[PDB]
Amino acid sequence: LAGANTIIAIMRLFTPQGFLRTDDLAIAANFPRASRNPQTYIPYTNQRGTVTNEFASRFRTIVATLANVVNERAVQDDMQKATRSCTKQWLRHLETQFD
Amino acid sequence: NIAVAHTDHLSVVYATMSNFMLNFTNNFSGNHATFKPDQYVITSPEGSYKPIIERQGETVDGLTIIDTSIVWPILCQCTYPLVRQSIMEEIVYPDPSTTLSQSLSVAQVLSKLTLPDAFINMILSGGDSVVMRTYQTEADDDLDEGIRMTTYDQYLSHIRERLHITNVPDPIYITGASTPDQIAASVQATHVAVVLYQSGVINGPASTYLRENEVLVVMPDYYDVVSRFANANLQMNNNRYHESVLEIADIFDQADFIQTSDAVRQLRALMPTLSTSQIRHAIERIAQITDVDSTDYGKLTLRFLGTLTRSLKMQNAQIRRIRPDGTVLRYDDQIDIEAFRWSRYFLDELQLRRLSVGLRLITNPRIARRFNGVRIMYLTDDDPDPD
Amino acid sequence: IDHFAAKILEDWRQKEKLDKGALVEADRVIQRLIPLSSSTYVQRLAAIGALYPNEFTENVLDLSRLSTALLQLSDTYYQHANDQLRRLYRRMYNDSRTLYMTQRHQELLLAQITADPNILLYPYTYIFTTIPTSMNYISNTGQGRIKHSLT
Amino acid sequence: KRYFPENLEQNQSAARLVSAVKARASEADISSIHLAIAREVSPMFNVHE
Amino acid sequence: MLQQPTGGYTTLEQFAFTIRNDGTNATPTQFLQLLSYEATENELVKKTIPTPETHLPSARNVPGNVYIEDAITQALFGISAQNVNAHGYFSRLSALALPNTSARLGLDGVIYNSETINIPFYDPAAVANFAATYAKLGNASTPRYRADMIDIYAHVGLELAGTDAERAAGVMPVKRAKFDSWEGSLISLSRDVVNWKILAFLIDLCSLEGEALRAFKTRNRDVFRMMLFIMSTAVAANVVNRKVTKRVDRVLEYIGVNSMRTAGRTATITYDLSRHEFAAKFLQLTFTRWNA
Ligand SMILES: Nc1ncnc2c1ncn2[C@@H]1O[C@H](COP(=O)(O)OP(=O)(O)OP(=O)(O)O)[C@@H](O)[C@H]1O
Ligand SMILES: [Mg+2]
């Protein structure tokens, strides 16, 4: 949307990192399934590289985006100015938890 | 009455303390209007940076709260060796040895403190990777052959920050108006072979260049990618590609940035898939194997410091100034000190020197005595040669 | 930045007076500073500063906020439609420690050396040829609405 | 728990942050955690809120 | 004593200069063939080199036999050398500068105070020629006599990267040198040069005259360029490698531009400030001899 880019860009953090998967085994087993073509969306896939994790890197760009968000936040109270920078540190620590 | 002592005595103590080993930063410039401390961080491409200065708010046993009231005792209820002169106190000229021996102890500790972490992260530096699809431009191409592609998201998460660390011009967008020679100029400017796609169909000579030269095109998304190329050959097709990993070592090749020796390549190939916790476990075991020597003052600083180090990723950690606005500046030859241009995996020059010899040792055929594969077969054992 | 700005202004006024061919008491032939170590922005000032761009003679820049204007000018020169001026500016930006001067300056340096053989002047220098530009901008800072007569 | 870097929980400026996080952080309970996992694949016959 | 041939000492097979490459002992020239250049927007324009000072530093009373060759080669291409100006034994070369001195420059690269048995040495006249210039390496450090460490490198570029046309013109584009390369190539090259008996090249560059000298300059141009290459890698701002279809091309940027950088790096041998003044003085002298 032409004027509200930052909103959409924040909204893209919510897009899933998994994949859509046909229920192959349930089809072969002839298990009941109301959908004409059965499938479920697995939230995440297996790590494929020896070191990098696509999921954790995703979260890294998410917390980076959010850190930019908190950074761009105007504040007037001094305490709010403080919790801004602390929020930034706590994000940067969540990143490592997630990793 | 106090001014004579503050000017003629305290000043040489500030002057002498300015030369001490560990007082490693500029404190001021004299301009209140403009002095902002230089703000280095230990950034890594695969993690958040640690600012060296932060409002971490820990009082360090009350070190960081500043009572201005302290000027009152100074002006009024304190005496000085110079002011007293009507008794003449002799001035004290303290031995170097006490602070030097301390400063050295600290330097000795914190020098080696990072070593096991440094070694492992030095090995794994080439191991970071991006998923990439290789579409085939022509018939009878091996699946490894063809134009190589990666999502913009992968270029952002890995390749771009490393371009910042390597301090090179940003790779050109290719609009399909682009000549192969322009792509060449870009790859020459940024030594990693990469070009962001922008828009429009890409002409065929450029495609043969992107194929022959193994340039990794950075497509924004994989939506009908064959529409993006002038597939005059008509061999390229959306269902016809081969996905695979691409290690950072398979793209970058800077020397003190990213270990890329065929030896370490091989050693990495032998490795099991790794989580960050497995790596931390490696580091802790390497640390436990070699209990580093330290002088008693060093054990004292160690226990004062004095615990975890594990919060910080050091995958390709570097030291870089951040702008106060919060962006991480590229290394600047005229501002930042030269020693920061590459953390050399935080190893000493001599360790790097020996390390090359050791890579010659590890890669040696004579010690490659773990054997893979076997052959079950039912023969007589008549004349036993192990060979 | 503010020092480099004032010096660039001084050398441009001086070179402008020299190019008109008037005899002038230049206290030093190249009035502008030579960064030895500086941030990027200073190197941009040094670059467009050494270009002696037509825009100053045309008063296209606003001198009230000089360095800003200078930074702005540099950007256009950084991506100039003229290949010559763009390659020239780029070159000056990558060799900021070198002093750049037109030939007509250099002869004055040689005269200054022939007069006092042991005079010290900056060792690292390059003699670029000035690139002509045909765009004769009208301009006038200062009050007064323009009363156009359209053709 | 691992919610806060040391020693940000102790920093005075962080109070308004720390309390906020503590307002959100439920204590762990396997029945609830497993339930959150299972709900992802179990069919929904009454619109969740 | 070794008699000097009609050509230089370099004509002897004893003094062959050959960097290791592709499993064989390559002559420097056939390594220089591997080099290729990416021209950039900048121009190198060579200024006239200032005449080296008349003064020859005193060779202070040293009882022992100074190993001059090893010192010069390590100040020039050493992987670990530093504070090359601190000892200041380069001045010792001056002891050879006198007529009829009892000092001898041995093939070992030692300066004996006295002629001694079973140690072959260069003809004292030619060595007096070589010392008559290169003793001035002894004042590479003294404030009155330091070389420019910025301008001289443009000459290096021309003598290394330059085409015959750019060379005759005296002005070439700044170039980014590159070559298909093996692991640790610059360190291996530089160590293969530290082993060179460069005093042979220097003594012939100083002693030979007339047409016989000129044939030296062509025959040994590539050697000079190899030393120049190790120096230019020592001052290059960065030495990237490029992946290209399972072949790696080492690339140093840039030839002919001293970056003054002094921080170490795995890729190439590094100059302390002292080695910058040393190499710059060495270049002033060596080019001053080279062009005549
Ligand atoms: N006027 C200029 N002169 C020389 N180099 C420039 C100039 N403008 C940009 N560059 C180079 O190109 C890059 C462009 O950076 P970018 O334009 O995003 O922000 P910037 O450096 O503040 O420039 P600008 O002020 O034009 O935004 C910089 O890293 C700089 O090295
Ligand atoms: Mg003045």
Please give the structure tokens belonging to residue B374. 């076997």
Q: Write the DSSP string, chain E.
A: -BPP-SS-GGGSGGG----EETTEE--THHHHTT-EEEEEEEEEEPPPPPPPPS---------S-EEHHHHHHHHHH-SS---HHHH-GGGGGGGGGSTT-S-EEBTTSEEESS--TT--BB-HHHHHHHHHHHGGGGGSSSTTTPPPSSTHHHHHHHHHT--HHHHHHTEEEEEEEEEE--TTHHHHHHHHHHTS-HHHHHHHHHH--THHHHHHHHHTHHHHHHHHHHHHHHH-SEEEEEE-SS-EEEEEEEET------S--TTS----HHHHHHHHHHHHHHHHHH--
Please give the structure tokens belonging to residue A58. 């995703």
Q: Which residues pair with B243 in a beta bridge?
A: B133
Is the Cα dihedral B354, B355, B356, B358 positive or negative? positive
Question: What's CA E104's distance to the chain center, in Å?
Answer: 22
Query: Which residues have CB under 8 Å from B261's CB, separation 6+?
Result: B359, E183
Our answer on whether B and C touch (3+ beta-carbon pairs < 8 Å) is yes
Burial of E83 (0-12, 13-18, 19+ CB in 10 A): exposed
Cβ separation B274–A51 shorter than 8 A: yes
Instruction: Return d(Cα B141, Cα B147) in angstroms, integer.
Output: 11
Query: Which residues have CB under 8 Å from B233's CB, separation 6+?
Result: B137, B138, B204
CB B57 within 8 A of CB D13: yes
Neighbours of E195 (CB within 10 A): 14
Give the amino acid at A92: R
Closest CA to B228 of B207, B255, B257: B207
Q: How far is CA B60 from each of CA B67, B188, E116, rounded to the nearest angstrom?
A: 15, 50, 70
Given a contact as 3+ CB pairs under 8 Å, which chains touch B?
Answer: A, C, D, E
Cβ-based contacts of B335 with chain C (< 8 Å): 37, 39
Q: Which residues pair with B129 in a beta bridge?
A: B247
CB B337 within 8 A of CB B141: no
Element (H, E) at B40: strand B40-41
C41 is in an annotated binding site: no
Which of A83, A87, A97 has the CB atom closest to D2's CB atom?
A: A97
Say how many CA atoms lie within 13 Å of B66 toward its Cβ.
3
Cβ separation E41–C87 shorter than 8 A: yes
- Which ligand 1 atom sits nearest the alpha carbon of residue C90? 4
Q: How far is CA B50 from each of CA B75, B313, C87, rounded to the nearest angstrom?
A: 41, 9, 39
Instruction: Return d(Cα E160, Cα E252) in angstroms, integer.
Output: 13
Our answer on whether A and B touch (3+ beta-carbon pairs < 8 Å) is yes
Bridge pairing between strands C99-100 and B40-41: unpaired
In three-state secondary structure terms, D9 is coil
Query: Which residues have CB under 8 Å from B63's CB, separation 6+?
Result: none
Q: Write the DSSP string, B245-282.
A: EEEGGGT---TTTS---HHHHHHHHHSPP--HHHHHHH
Which of B212, B251, B356 has the CB atom closest to E184's CB atom?
A: B356
Neighbours of C20 (CB within 10 A): 8
Closest CA to C49 of C61, C37, B119: C61
Given a contact as 3+ CB pairs under 8 Å, which chains touch C?
Answer: B, E
Give the amino acid at C8: I
Q: Which residues pair with D14 in a beta bridge?
A: none
Burial of D38 (0-12, 13-18, 19+ CB in 10 A): exposed
Nearest ligand, CA of residue C42? 1
Instruction: Return d(Cα E45, Cα E170) in angstroms, integer.
Output: 6
Q: Look-up: residue for tokens 């100059």?
A: E271
Give the structural domain span for B201. Answer: 127-253
CB E242 within 8 A of CB B191: yes
Instruction: Return d(Cα C80, Cα C55) in angstroms, integer.
Output: 13
Q: Chain C residues within 8 A (CB-CB) of chain B?
A: 37-40
HEC readout, E46-84:
CCCCCCCCCCCCCCCCCCCCEEHHHHHHHHHHCCCCCCH
Nearest ligand, CA of residue C26? 2
Q: How many residues does chain C have?
A: 151
Method: cryo-EM
Instruction: Return d(Cα B358, Cα B364) in angstroms, integer.
Output: 10
CB B76 within 8 A of CB B350: no
Which of E40, E41, E45 has the CB atom closest to C126's CB atom?
A: E45
Question: What's CA E122's distance to the chain center, in Å?
Answer: 19
Query: Which residues have CB under 8 Å from E231's CB, separation 6+?
Result: E76, E77, E156, E279, E283
CB C141 within 8 A of CB C59: yes
Neighbours of B174 (CB within 10 A): 26
Q: How far is CA E201 from each of CA B117, E96, E107, E218, E276, rounded to the nearest angstrom?
A: 48, 17, 12, 13, 22
CB E63 within 8 A of CB E174: no
Say how many CA atoms lie within 13 Å of E101 toward its Cβ.
23
Nearest ligand, CA of residue C39? 1
Domains in chain E: boundaries:
1-292
Question: What's CA C28's distance to the chain center, in Å?
Answer: 15
Longest pairwise C-alpha distance within chain C: 62
Burial of C62 (0-12, 13-18, 19+ CB in 10 A): exposed
CB B188 within 8 A of CB B182: no
C96 lines ligand 1 (CB under 6 A): no
Burial of B350 (0-12, 13-18, 19+ CB in 10 A): exposed
Task: Kindly list the strands in the beta sheet with E66-67, ordered across the sheet, starting from the edge strand earlier in the chain.
Answer: E66-67, E110-112, E104-105
The secondary structure of residue B228, as a DSSP letter, is G
Query: Which residues have CB under 8 Å from E9's CB, separation 6+?
Result: E2, E15, E122, E200, E203, E204
Neighbours of B120 (CB within 10 A): 18
Q: Which residues pair with B219 in a beta bridge?
A: B151
Element (H, E) at A41: strand A39-42
The residues in B 323-382 lying below 8 A from C, measured between CB atoms, are 332, 334-335
CB C5 within 8 A of CB C45: yes
